[PDB]
Subunit: 347 residues, 4 copies
């Protein structure tokens, strides 16, 4: 069954050369399932890990990818509630200690001892990958793993973000970057949660996707000179909560100025060396909160996958081969990425 | 009874010359009480209004002061629940429309039609001042107005701040600037609310005051080279919620780095041209919220004055004459202001 | 313009004889608008006030009706933000003191000095009725007052209820009584807010209405022997939050047993002499909250009318004449009332 | 080291004869620590389990006790973050699946697969007891296990209760039963959390203990004919949140009538066959919530033990021998139990 080797996209140096090579099969640990990753979404976090954009250092050599979805071909001796052949998902947060004050409060992502799939752990860009059994996702039997894969890191993330904005049904939510991997899922989640979804994006075929997936008001950031004025006029005073899934520091800076008094500006995107320089006078006078949202926890994964299972969200995926993966980064560095890309580990 | 003129500190131009002059008695409007301001605290907001540090423009000529406490010598024809001779307080937020979506949610301070005592309305640096009857403070009979006056804008403010940090009893709260007008009241409120109060301040006689009023750990910002390291070591991982009552943009910038994961950094101080340039990567990874807190609303005023009436808080006040007021600004611009100053309108 | 008399349904004794008689025009007070009530919904609260089912005593003689919707033909001298000819709504809570600790926290309905339209104040079953100007509803210009009228007391009520259940999008909400005046609006609001709406009702043509307005799972209380088992099987463990808009004490009693652990059982209906006898062991073991929800406040009115203005909710109204009103009570006492009834004051 | 047998209080039938007998040493499972229980508090839950007062059936034969505190003399092969000789605590909730939707949200106590120490698992009334390694309490090194033991089930319980009442600092909290095992710890926690603690209890030496531990207003339930009137007069309108740690159904019934509008009535005590028959009219009109609170979770255990470690709480313990345990039940059935009793496993 479980082979001796496999294929995988591995790079031995930051910003180096991606190698679609042959790598050994990862033996599962005492509590880590061995999942035959069928499909795996490509997240911009993988591009950041390749470029080395973040202060934390990656593990080298690295096989990226933190949105794996596959079958449990193997399991460690100590795993509790899993069966071989079941569907499971390798999220960004591979595992935690489950014993510090962060994992006790449900904030498992903010843990000092967190294994990050594809950053400090062999990710999901490989045929077989290992992932903890208490943190992996309980993908229901019968789903289409290709469609599920983008939900595992871009779905739970924007779900947790919109839950962190402290919005109510009917409150304007302005997805800043609402045509990308997270922007489109953010729009679908915010539409399913009852909010009124404004969107801010630009490029070729961004407005078409945004309108199709169920947005309300789209504001082109490459054709509107004053974005703040446009959002203040469209939302009648500002968005009640902004989600910054963009990769532009200027977008984040302009995001704290079109949110209402008593609003909330969730920071989800983490561009390279970006600082949210919000004016203190305007932030205090308007009581604007600027929350930061990291990947969702286990309850958030359950609720996001439950939104998916109901058919409310559907990430627009381009399924390609694994070998094409380097070009995707180029297509993602230029910004020409619409929706999400998923890689099939088979090819 | 109500005279024809009075004395007041009035300035006709931003950063101009403060004039302890004779000014007419303000006739109350249809719903505004006429309060004989007995004492009035001096808030740093008055210094900012004098310097013109804020983008919004003041009304000129202006008599500053938004912490007035006095007796209701007169009342408009339409006031509902007030009696002549009762004790009342002129807060910063003079009045609101009580009809927009901000006043309906209790966020009366964030209202487009808000009268700001001492900024867009003749403040409390005068013998008799007028203030709305639904927004003024219900100062209980028997209190000492001299001690109450600093509670009216510096007490409700830090009470609302600590309530905005979403702290629990036992959670470390790091008052950044915990020896000034708001810092000392913030320390007393955070101590009465159950939090463990760390303090960050420096100068002559700041640590003595901080220890006396009930602080736990004091970190001298003029003798600790690495404040972030000191707070991370003292709080064991960071403060669970920071209150930025300081007037240093550098303090605000360093305040987003010693707050725990899932923390909260309430911005209360509004220095001149200050920007909270928090790192986006470190904010998103740690889920750090950066809330801004403006003056408290009517419920917050009630609860802050109720903390005062129990004797839990006591602002260290230096009661001086009104004529001394200009020098106070100097003593406040240099930073040598410890605790709070209150002016007696009589002299 | 404003006439000398008018027609109105007035009863001089509890459970007495309803008299469609001629009554004088109510002169507006200093702050109370005089609204020419065009249409007025008939709420079961009016039936309870007629029967005397509640411990509090009504004012006699009384013209009931607390869901009035009309034009502002007159206004008191002290009203602030109203224009003659504008659309306004007489809600259940006519007015408050706006000065106690309940009105300061936004809980204006829980006020010791609350005027209740149609209970302690001449209600909206009359051509012209008076209602406070800070508490009345800001009905947008262009709406259809006939359709708006049921939203004014049955819409804001169930909106506040579903907001009190502390639900999340995707959480099962079980409207117990989901075909009546409040049940149908509760179903539409819970569907617009993202929840998954289960419904419990029975009779002739209740399931048809429930399916039409957008319910998910309907459980017939006159054809299911074990309602608790049915809800536990349909919701997979119980409803995440129940709304008790029914008028059966048995329904309320059975409502605390099919709500999940960590659930919430909002009590909205107030039957005559009803007691929610929930088992203490089962409530403590499952951490079940039993919240009670009274009419919504001004923010809740704004958000409920904003849900209506978007076209998300639509109360199924039977518009009849005012003279028919007594028979409605019969049609409401027998339980044959489907949706809502509205009376046109003209006829 | 670990012996072959031990002594323990074991009963083979509900309400039968307690046998201080010799029982074998429990071998730890794969993930369960073996704790040499030094001391163990006696909770009224143990009396209920002996009497069979609850619908759920106990495991027979049973050694009760769910407040064990001891040293980790042994550990299973799969335990993660424990060392032999460390201090640990056997709480009521022995362990959970950590995989259902309740354990994911932190509500581990509400789990269908929950091991209850001393109810479905050999409790802490024995020299050596086994308890899961992810759920046991991290008792800091240096504490006095005798004093800690009552915190493990009566401390975390009332801490979670007072956190469930949604109180603010300064809000009156009325501990109903504020001289018993939970009442005294509830008073100390509510005093440390900032609330104003009213107390309701009666008997010999209850008021003395309540005054000593830091209560504010004591209301004798055996000398006040009208408890509701007394609490409404003392709290000025009612308690802002009630904690029902009593064992009287009448106390629970009267507890929903002296809580303010928008209050909260946490149900902590679970008397035999008790029903909280709260009036629906009075509950809906006043928006009174009736929350039920079960044992606290891991975060709640951490925060309660952290309140203890600061020296803020101190359960008044009578340390006795294990053999005396049956008489304690008598002393607890008659109601003559003041504070808490702890048993030393050595004797
Ligand atoms: N916080 C988390 O838990 C988490 C998880 C995964 C990814 N991320 C981060 O999210 C970011 C975005 O990921 P993605 O998959 O959406 O990337 P993407 O490149 O697929 O999409 C980025 C989007 O931003 C839009 N955009 C670019 N400039 C803009 C501007 N000035 N204003 C508005 N929109 C603008 C683009 O048009 C595109 O729609 C990355 O930094 C990624 O690492 C966060
Ligand atoms: N947000 C509101 O509702 C509200 C209301 C009133 C005032 N304010 C603002 O609060 C600010 C402070 O007011 P105040 O009365 O406390 O002023 P103050 O001058 O009396 O006290 C300022 C304090 O900051 C300390 N400080 C200075 N530099 C510091 C640094 N680098 N790090 C830490 N602490 C430092 C000083 O030593 C002093 O203790 C002003 O900008 C004022 O306008 C806010
Ligand atoms: N709390 C508030 O703010 C507020 C405001 C207005 C009205 N109310 C109260 O709401 C209650 C209901 O009002 P309404 O207009 O919906 O009344 P209604 O008579 O129009 O509708 C009652 C509904 O209850 C259903 N029902 C009857 N027995 C049932 C049972 N055993 N199980 C489930 N459903 C059952 C009926 O079939 C019907 O669908 C009244 O007591 C009213 O006074 C509350
Ligand atoms: N919910 C939970 O997580 C949890 C955990 C442990 C125990 N409990 C339950 O808590 C209850 C109480 O436990 P305990 O250790 O405090 O019991 P206890 O017998 O030690 O103390 C009971 C207290 O109730 C007081 N009391 C009696 N009648 C009263 C009345 N009419 N009004 C007010 N006070 C009255 C007594 O005087 C005494 O102070 C038990 O039912 C127990 O099983 C709950
Ligand atoms: Zn990602
Ligand atoms: Zn951890
Ligand atoms: Zn101020
Ligand atoms: Zn306003
Ligand atoms: Zn009604
Ligand atoms: Zn009131
Ligand atoms: Zn117990
Ligand atoms: Zn579980």
């Amino acid at each position: 069954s479980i082979p001796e080797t496999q294929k995988g996209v591995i790079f031995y140096e930051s910003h180096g050369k991606l190698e679609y090579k042959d790598i050994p099969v990862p033996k599962p640990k005492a509590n880590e399932l061995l999942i035959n990753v069928k499909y795996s979404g490509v997240c911009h976090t993988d591009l950041h890990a390749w470029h080395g954009d973040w202060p934390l250092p990656t593990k080298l050599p690295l096989v990226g990818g933190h949105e794996g979805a596959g079958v449990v071909v193997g399991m460690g001796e100590n795993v509790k509630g899993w069966k071989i052949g079941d569907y499971a998902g390798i999220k960004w947060l591979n595992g935690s200690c489950m014993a510090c004050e962060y994992c006790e409060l449900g904030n498992e992502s903010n843990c000092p001892h967190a294994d990050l799939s594809g950053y400090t752990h062999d990710g999901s860009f490989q045929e077989y990958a290992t992932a903890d059994a208490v943190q992996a996702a309980h993908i229901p039997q019968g789903t289409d793993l290709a469609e599920v894969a983008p939900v595992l890191c871009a779905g739970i993330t924007v779900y947790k973000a919109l839950k962190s904005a402290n919005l109510m049904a009917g409150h304007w939510v302005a997805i800043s970057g609402a045509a990308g991997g997270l922007g489109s899922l953010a729009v679908q989640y915010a539409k399913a949660m009852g909010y009124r979804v404004l969107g801010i994006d630009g490029g070729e075929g961004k407005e078409e996707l945004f309108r199709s997936i169920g947005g309300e008001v789209f504001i082109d950031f490459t054709k509107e000179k004053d974005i703040v004025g446009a959002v203040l006029k469209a939302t009648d005073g500002g968005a009640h909560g902004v989600i910054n899934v963009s990769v532009s520091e200027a977008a984040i800076e302009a995001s704290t100025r079109y949110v209402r008094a008593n609003g909330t500006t969730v920071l989800v995107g983490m561009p390279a060396g970006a600082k949210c320089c919000s004016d203190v006078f305007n932030q205090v006078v308007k009581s604007i909160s600027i929350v930061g949202s990291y990947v969702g926890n286990r309850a958030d994964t359950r609720e996001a996958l439950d939104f998916f299972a109901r058919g409310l969200v559907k990430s627009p995926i381009k399924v390609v081969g694994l070998s094409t993966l380097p070009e995707i980064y180029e297509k993602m560095e230029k910004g020409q990425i619409v929706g999400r890309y998923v890689v099939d580990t088979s090819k």
